[PDB]
Structures are given as C-alpha cells and as structure tokens.
Amino acid sequence: RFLKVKNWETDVVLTDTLHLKSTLETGCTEHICMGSIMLPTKDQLFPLAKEFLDQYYSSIKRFGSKAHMDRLEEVNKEIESTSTYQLKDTELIYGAKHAWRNASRCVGRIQWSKLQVFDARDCTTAHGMFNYICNHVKYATNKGNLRSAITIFPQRTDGKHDFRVWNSQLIRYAGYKQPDGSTLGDPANVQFTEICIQQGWKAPRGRFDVLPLLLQANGNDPELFQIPPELVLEVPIRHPKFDWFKDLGLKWYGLPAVSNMLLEIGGLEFSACPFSGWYMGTEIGVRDYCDNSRYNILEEVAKKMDLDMRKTSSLWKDQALVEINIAVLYSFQSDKVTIVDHHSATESFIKHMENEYRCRGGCPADWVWIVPPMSGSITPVFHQEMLNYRLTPSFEYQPDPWNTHVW
Amino acid sequence: RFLKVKNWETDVVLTDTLHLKSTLETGCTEHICMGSIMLPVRTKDQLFPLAKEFLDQYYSSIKRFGSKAHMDRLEEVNKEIESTSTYQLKDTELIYGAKHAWRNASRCVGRIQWSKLQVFDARDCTTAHGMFNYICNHVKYATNKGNLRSAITIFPQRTDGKHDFRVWNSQLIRYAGYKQPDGSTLGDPANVQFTEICIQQGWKAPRGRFDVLPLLLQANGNDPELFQIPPELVLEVPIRHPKFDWFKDLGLKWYGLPAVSNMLLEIGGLEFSACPFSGWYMGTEIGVRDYCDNSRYNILEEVAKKMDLDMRKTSSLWKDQALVEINIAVLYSFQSDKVTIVDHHSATESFIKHMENEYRCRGGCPADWVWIVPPMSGSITPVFHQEMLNYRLTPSFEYQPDPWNTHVWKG
Ligand code: HEM
Ligand code: HEM
Ligand SMILES: C[C@H](O)[C@H](O)[C@H]1CNc2nc(N)[nH]c(=O)c2N1
Ligand SMILES: C[C@H](O)[C@H](O)[C@H]1CNc2nc(N)[nH]c(=O)c2N1
Ligand SMILES: CCONC(=N)NCCC[C@H](N)C(=O)O
Ligand SMILES: CCONC(=N)NCCC[C@H](N)C(=O)O
Ligand SMILES: [Zn+2]
C-alpha cells in the first residue's frame, strides 16, 4: 500500500503514496509484467469531473469551500443538461500542466509548471487551426531560445466532429520508397508522406523535406497547409573536429512538437492538442540518426572515421555513435538553439523526482523510457527504482486518424 | 489466452502461450508496474503438488508422460514425502532441473547456451572442507585454461532450514574492498561488508586494489569457515588498450570467471541454498558497470584525464567517450589472452535468435527488458527494440537474504 523505491547508487530511499490515487490500468498483472510493451456517458462523466475538480480546488487550498461545491453543482447541472461541460480557463491551464506532470515517460518534467497554454477552443476551421499552429510554432521557437507550449483545440463532442492534427509532430521530414527498393528521407513517415501526396502535396522528393500540415476541423476532411519556411528553425550538423562531417549533408529541426496525442482533463477529451518543448540530444543523434529503421547512418560515419568495421568487438558502432552525438549537441549549441544532453537531463529528472516525492508523495515514471538510449548506466536514472502508474489528467495515445476517418 | 510481442525494428510479431504455465507472482498489479524494482521450510501439504508439476514436466520432456515409469516415480516420491517429509531427485531430474532454472532466468541474456551446462552433483557433501574441494574442481573445470565452460555445483538441499549449506561469497571470485578512515575506498566498494566479515573471521588482508577474497563456506548449518582458492586456479587478465599505450599503466586487471554463488535454486519444490554457477563475461559487465559505476571502481575521470578530453562540460560527452575506450580495452585484453568473452552486440543478437526459437518450439521466453538491454549503447542493440514479457517459471533461481543476517552463530 505504501511503496518504497531505492536509488542503488546513492542508497536514497523514497516512499510512494501517490500511486494509491491511481485510476487507469497498466497492462500488467500479478502473473505477467508488460513494462516493455509500447502500447499496453453522462453517468461516466460526473465521477470524472468530480475527481478533477476536487484535485483542482485542493491545489488552490479551497477544498470543500463554497466555491468548490458551487462549481461541482454547476458542472453537474451542465452535464445532466448538455451531456458535457466546459472548463474554466483556470481549470484548463491546471489540467494541461498536470497532464505533463503525470506523463510517466517524460524525462523533462522538472519543467512542468512552466507551460504556456494557448486556448484554441474558439477555433472552427482548418485554416483557423493553421493560424493557431503557426503562432504556437513562432512563440515556442522564440529565435532558438525555446519555450514550452501547448495549443488546445475544441474538445470531442459526439466523436463525429473531432479536431485532429494528422501529423505525428508539427515538424517532421517526409519519407519516400524508391524503385531502388530503398527509402529516401525518413522511413518513419513513408505512409503519412503518401497520404499527403494522395491529397495533392507536391513533394520535393529530397532527404529532408518538411511535411505539410494535414489539419482536420470539426470532423471534416483534413486540408493541407505549408508552414512558413521562415517559422521552421533547422540546424546544419557539423562536428567540432571532423571537418568531413558537414559533408554528410545532415540537418535537423529545433522544435519537437508532438501533435498526435489526446489530452484528457476531467473526463473531457481534447483530440488535437499539439505540445512542444525542446530536444534531448540523444533523441536525434542516437534514435533519429542511428536506428536501423530511421536515417540509419552508422555505417557511413564509421567509414568516414576509418574504423575497423570487420568485427563487432572493435566497438566501431559505439565509437561512431558517440561522435554523431557530440556533433548534434555541438551544432545546436553553436547556433544557439536550446538542447539538453542526456547527462544534464537525467540529473534534472532525479532532482524533480525528489521534489515530487516530498511535495506530492510520488512521481510516476517509466524506467524503460526514462533511461537514455546510449550510456544508460552512467546516467543516474539507470540506478533509480521507479514506480509506473497512471494518473489523470493525462496524455494518451489514440489511433491514427486515417484508419478511422470516414471521408 | 495468447499474448503478442512486436519488434519495432523488424515488425516481427511473436505469440506467447507459455505465460499460461506461470505460477509465481511478479510484484506488478493492474494499477502499478514494478518492472524496475531490483528485488520486488515447506509443508508436506504444499510439497507434493510442487513435485508432481515438476515430474510431469520432466516426463513430458523425455516423451514418457503417463508412462508406467512416470506413474511409479510419482507414487515413489509421494510415499517418500509422506514418510520422510521431503524427497531426493534422481540425477537425471537434477540435471534437467538445473538446465531449466537457467532456461527460465528472465534477466539472463546468455540463455542461447542453456542446454550446455555441466552439472556437478555435490549432494554427498557434508563439510566446509568438502565444499572447498568441490568449488576448486568447479573453478578449474569451468576455467579450462581460458576456454570457459558453463558449470553449476549443487550442494545438499534445505531440510528444516536449520542445516543450510551456504556460500557466503556473492561470487566465487571477487576482489576485496576496504573502507579507509578518510572515507575513501580501496579495492571494490561492492564487497566492503563481506571483506569486513572475512577479516573478522581471521583473514589476513593484503589490502591492495585487486585482492581475491577467500571463500567463506557454511556446511550443514554450522558456522562458516575460510579457505583460500589456490592462486594457480584464479585466471586473471591485465587490461590494456590496442592503441592507447598508457592504458596499461592504469594498473587494471579483472578475473576471467564470473561465478554467482549467492542464489537459491528451486526444483520441484526443493530448495538448493548453495548452488554456485558460472559461464563467461559479456564485456560491458566489467567495462561499463564494474569499472565505471560511481559506486564501483569509478575510473571514468582518470581515463578521461589521460585522454585529455574536454571535462569542463558534460555536453562534450567526455564520459561517453572514455566509456567506449575502456570497453574496447576489456574486449581487446580478454581476446589477446584467449579468454572467452562476448561483446554486447554479438550477445544481444544471439539472444534475439534464442528468443525467437523459444517462441516457436516452447511457446514463449520470459525476459526482463530492464536487465536484458546492455548498460551502454542500448538502442543500437536489437534487444532495445524488442517487446518482452516477464513472468516466473519453475524450476528457477531466486534471491535469498545474505546469510550473515539470518545465521544463528553456534560459536
Ligand atoms: C522542455 C523540455 C522537454 C524535454 C527535454 C522532454 C523530454 C522527453 C523525452 C526524451 C521523451 C521520450 C520521447 C521519445 O523517446 O520519443 C519524452 C516523452 C514525452 N513527453 Fe516530454 N520533454 C519535454 C517537454 C514536454 C512537454 C512540454 C510535454 C507536454 C506538455 C511533454 C510530454 C511528454 C509525453 C506525454 C511523453 C511520452 C509521449 C510518448 O509516449 O510518445 N514533454 N519527453
Ligand atoms: C554462458 C555465458 C553467460 C553469459 C554471457 C550470461 C550473461 C548474463 C548477464 C550479462 C547477466 C546480468 C548480470 C548483471 O548485470 O549482473 C546475467 C544474469 C543472470 N544469469 Fe546469465 N550468463 C551466462 C551464463 C549463465 C549461467 C550458466 C547461468 C546459470 C546456470 C546463468 C543464470 C543467470 C541468472 C539466474 C541471472 C540473474 C542474476 C541476478 O538477478 O543477479 N547465466 N547473465
Ligand atoms: C520495445 C521497447 O519498449 C521500445 O523499444 C522502447 C524502449 N524505450 C524507449 N524509450 C524512449 N525514450 N523512446 C522509445 O521510443 C523507446 N522505445
Ligand atoms: C533500478 C534498476 O532496476 C537497477 O539499476 C537495474 C537496472 N538494470 C540492470 N541490468 C543488469 N543487467 N544488471 C543490473 O544490475 C541492473 N540494475
Ligand atoms: C514534444 C515535447 O518535447 N519532447 C521531446 N523532447 N521529444 C518528444 C518526441 C520527439 C522525438 N523523439 C524525436 O526525436 O523527434
Ligand atoms: C555466473 C554466470 O554468468 N553470468 C554472467 N556473465 N555474469 C554474472 C554476474 C557477473 C557480474 N555482473 C560481474 O560483473 O562480476
Ligand atoms: Zn509490470
């Protein structure tokens, strides 16, 4: 009922009680752990609204005040009548900040209380959505000095009028299959890149073509829009000692902006809620550049480095990986675009966990995601026991819209 | 019920039915996952079902399920239990059992090898001197002049929990650690407490950075006794780097034989509290964890200095740079001395082939992702991209508390 987690490097032991407030299910049972699986009504709504509004008023030191109870009646009356309800601005901001605070897979949560919330609930069309998104992109990018933000479009109603951003991130590169059988660009986006084409996009057919936004408003068919190029900050990748590195022709964008998730607050569902922060270097250098199913560049780099690629035991992949990652951090830093290294980020998250334990009685965390994809054990999170559980408000995955939309 | 696992790199999807034969608990519930938590006297009553389940698996495996030989063996064990409160395994069932505990070890990446295990039956042992002799023979056999061979030695099972055989060392071969008055540690900080116990028991400590510890052996519930492994039996490798000539002068070496001695082996409800086993090293165990953990030898800085890396900011990735070089050095050294070792790429690729084979022929392979993924270069190994299902099968290896915490001193 009261659980302890230990850091095996420092012996620090924390007691978790926050998990008892957990509500949603994990996918595990007493017989089987699924910790490494990637994807494990009016009557229903008031209980969810009540639970939310109680935590909200408790947070503002007004638990069981008249203003607390009045709002509970108000929302009750509103549900019983309209079969849904609308969040006050204060509640919406609180709900969004807490969805982030509760995101067990996010290592950057020390930042959670500094989130700029853009309320786009007045939006009615895809052009309106495009305008909101451009403003989000420019605000957050801030000439390289990145600031966290989320833009929140109207909540789901009958599910036949959903707002959706079809892109997985606001800014990503296209992927094309060639006769060669190979992939040009980002293989992760081949399908979407095709859906854009099938929709009219004129692909440049290059290695780093910024996809267009495919925006869906009020359940209508989605429309294409090109983000003003001048709003998309990109970084050419060079190495501080290998002059040949620049010749690899690599670049990445400065703004990570996840756009395909669903925000749930007080039982209300916001299916279009793009949010952004800034990168941890490994995301680009380890995963985007080196995953076999991504730009998969280890072989080329290794060759430029003249390493013995004869045998795995020379660790040539590991050598190349380090250099690639030095280059990413160096390039973002030189151009003054915000980026965090994995050492710095994980040390932050350990401090965040400790704040959260003493202030909230816990911090849900998914060790499988939090531990960086390179140099795991030389980062402090590797040695930290974590407990994973689901709190609400939350960000949730949702099915790709094209598998679900009826044209 | 069927459960699927996908590899996100290859899109290969596998179907698990084996988890259905899982009995023990995981520590997780529908409301909480404890997948990253390090550690999350039976009655006649609960013993015969444990025996039956085991013997039924054993007899199936030899294609004799339901045979007369099968039925007579159940009856014989049953009678032995009612009559003596326990039972003895046949040598064949012991071997099968110990191979299976390894097969079922979800935190072990080396399992492609499970069916090649030399089982040394030490159930006739009665004294700590007898244990010493069995352990020397195991170490010599397994070492094999550098061409390492997996082995396990199994001492008598638990009876009333008052006559336990225990190896107090956590591994048969390990280096001493000494806490200094100024708070620094000399040697391996992981073994300070055990080292202190050895010294109190009369060990004369050389007090250097790589002193091989003495064995502390408990037979039949008696107080443990100290023994020195013959030095000629302890194979060691001096660590040097293929391009960095100053690496040798760091003064590093390690031992070739990893041999876990503190686990409990359960087979058919029986409990073997002393069952040391050994295989060979994956390089990262030494070069990442034993050398670079802050709480172990902690050599990252000194290596980084020697290499003259920019150490003023973490974002130069100097730690990551020194880590790769150290791990190159460990693999280079073991290879050069012709001592078996496996790199993390080769090891994890083999594990994926093992795991897929196991799904096809066995219906599953319990695996603990947190432990299987190596502690450097995680995502450039194929295991990182592999969904895994973790669940508990018997026979099995289990943790048990350190014996200095539970032992009744006779004096
Ligand atoms: C400001 C700096 C931030 C940093 C450094 C950061 C870091 C990360 C990283 C490294 C991941 C793993 C992503 C992956 O491997 O694909 C992640 C996941 C996640 N982040 Fe954060 N993040 C930041 C901001 C935010 C913000 C502003 C939000 C929401 C408002 C957020 C919500 C999430 C969620 C929900 C996940 C899991 C998403 C999934 O399952 O794909 N993050 N974060
Ligand atoms: C043949 C070469 C082998 C290799 C390369 C190998 C590899 C590994 C590694 C890297 C670990 C994790 C170690 C750690 O981080 O502390 C491990 C754990 C384990 N291995 Fe293997 N192993 C091998 C042989 C064996 C054998 C022969 C057995 C038993 C007969 C065995 C049973 C186990 C068990 C029970 C664990 C979990 C240990 C724990 O929880 O501390 N392994 N193995
Ligand atoms: C199968 C496994 O769950 C999967 O590869 C996970 C592992 N950890 C991860 N961690 C992060 N941060 N991002 C990821 O995409 C993944 N992928
Ligand atoms: C807290 C966490 O579970 C702990 O550090 C684990 C993580 N993964 C591991 N993996 C292996 N192979 N060995 C270990 O000691 C650990 N330690
Ligand atoms: C979207 C908020 O920012 N979080 C973050 N740093 N990364 C989120 C996912 C980005 C993805 N891993 C990528 O490498 O493009
Ligand atoms: C004992 C069977 O072999 N297993 C193995 N390779 N490692 C076991 C533990 C060794 C430990 N990680 C060490 O670094 O000494
Ligand atoms: Zn679990």
Side-chain angles (χ1 to χ4, degrees), chain B residues 16-214:
Chain B
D16 183 301
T17 49
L18 184 57
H19 70 278
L20 294 169
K21 292 313 177 275
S22 170
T23 50
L24 314 172
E25 311 308 69
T26 61
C28 301
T29 76
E30 289 77 305
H31 289 113
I32 205 155
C33 173
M34 308 215 306
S36 75
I37 307 300
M38 197 105 88
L39 315 165
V41 61
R42 284 204 166 83
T43 314
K44 302 185 159 170
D45 170 54
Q46 62 258 182
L47 185 44
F48 189 78
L50 297 175
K52 184 167 187 308
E53 177 208 349
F54 174 67
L55 291 168
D56 282 354
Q57 304 170 204
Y58 174 68
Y59 275 90
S60 294
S61 83
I62 61 169
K63 301 205 191 52
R64 292 297 187 276
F65 179 96
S67 59
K68 190 177 179 304
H70 181 196
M71 295 296 100
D72 286 350
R73 180 57 177 151
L74 286 187
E75 194 185 302
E76 171 189 55
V77 166
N78 184 218
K79 286 181 33 158
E80 201 179 327
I81 294 179
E82 64 168 288
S83 150
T84 80
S85 301
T86 182
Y87 75 104
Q88 293 302 311
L89 289 174
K90 300 300 196 179
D91 294 353
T92 49
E93 296 162 351
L94 190 71
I95 289 159
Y96 173 90
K99 287 184 189 191
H100 280 74
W102 182 12
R103 197 175 183 182
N104 295 335
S106 69
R107 293 174 161 178
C108 177
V109 77
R111 279 177 287 165
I112 190 173
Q113 290 285 328
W114 73 269
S115 63
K116 294 138 210 173
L117 174 65
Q118 180 64 212
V119 174
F120 292 116
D121 185 348
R123 293 169 298 170
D124 67 0
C125 189
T126 72
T127 71
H129 276 92
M131 293 178 69
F132 178 63
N133 188 58
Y134 269 115
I135 291 177
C136 287
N137 290 347
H138 172 145
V139 169
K140 201 168 157 173
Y141 174 88
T143 301
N144 192 27
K145 307 210 159 149
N147 183 192
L148 275 38
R149 301 185 283 200
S150 300
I152 180 168
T153 292
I154 306 170
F155 292 106
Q157 64 211 44
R158 163 169 303 149
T159 52
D160 63 358
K162 293 177 180 196
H163 297 69
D164 285 4
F165 286 67
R166 295 293 294 275
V167 175
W168 290 35
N169 311 57
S170 58
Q171 298 181 23
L172 304 179
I173 302 183
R174 252 204 149 171
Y175 299 121
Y178 311 92
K179 187 71 162 189
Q180 298 293 59
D182 68 12
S184 73
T185 301
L186 171 51
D188 193 338
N191 305 317
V192 166
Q193 199 191 16
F194 178 79
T195 302
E196 287 170 354
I197 292 178
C198 288
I199 289 157
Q200 165 180 188
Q201 297 308 306
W203 190 52
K204 310 300 174 214
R207 309 191 62 90
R209 189 151 81 130
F210 297 106
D211 300 335
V212 173
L213 287 162

Side-chain angles (χ1 to χ4, degrees), chain B residues 171 174 254-255 258-260 277-282 285-286 290:
Chain B
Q171 298 181 23
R174 252 204 149 171
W254 205 252
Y255 50 92
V260 166
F277 51 88
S278 61
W280 54 80
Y281 267 111
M282 175 165 84
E285 304 178 70
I286 312 165
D290 306 341

Side-chain angles (χ1 to χ4, degrees), chain B residues 228-395:
Chain B
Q228 183 196 205
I229 315 188
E232 62 272 41
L233 259 36
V234 179
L235 178 59
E236 288 179 301
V237 184
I239 307 303
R240 61 283 187 187
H241 193 275
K243 318 185 197 333
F244 296 151
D245 174 62
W246 52 257
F247 201 99
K248 72 188 182 297
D249 302 311
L250 286 167
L252 308 168
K253 67 184 154 177
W254 205 252
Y255 50 92
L257 183 72
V260 166
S261 47
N262 59 3
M263 294 188 82
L264 175 153
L265 166 58
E266 164 171 5
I267 301 173
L270 307 180
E271 300 184 297
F272 300 87
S273 55
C275 57
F277 51 88
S278 61
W280 54 80
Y281 267 111
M282 175 165 84
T284 51
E285 304 178 70
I286 312 165
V288 184
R289 305 298 312 284
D290 306 341
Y291 282 164
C292 300
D293 271 6
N294 295 149
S295 292
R296 297 294 300 276
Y297 283 81
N298 193 205
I299 67 174
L300 274 181
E301 284 219 353
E302 179 192 18
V303 172
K305 297 199 196 292
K306 294 297 196 322
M307 300 181 59
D308 195 61
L309 301 173
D310 186 354
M311 293 183 54
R312 303 168 311 198
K313 44 187 157 53
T314 56
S315 69
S316 68
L317 300 199
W318 63 267
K319 297 201 182 175
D320 312 73
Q321 286 195 282
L323 187 65
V324 180
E325 291 311 328
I326 290 159
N327 275 272
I328 284 168
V330 176
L331 290 162
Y332 177 65
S333 291
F334 275 63
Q335 286 162 186
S336 291
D337 285 352
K338 299 184 144 63
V339 182
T340 314
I341 192 159
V342 63
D343 67 82
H344 57 288
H345 302 290
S346 162
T348 54
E349 179 174 1
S350 284
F351 181 74
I352 293 295
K353 294 171 177 165
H354 171 62
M355 184 189 171
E356 286 164 342
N357 189 47
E358 289 281 79
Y359 270 76
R360 283 131 191 178
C361 80
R362 196 183 198 197
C365 177
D368 178 342
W369 192 104
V370 169
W371 277 62
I372 295 294
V373 176
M376 69 179 287
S377 305
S379 75
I380 64 169
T381 71
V383 287
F384 178 100
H385 303 273
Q386 181 66 56
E387 298 190 334
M388 296 176 195
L389 287 176
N390 187 209
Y391 51 81
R392 291 170 66 196
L393 299 175
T394 49

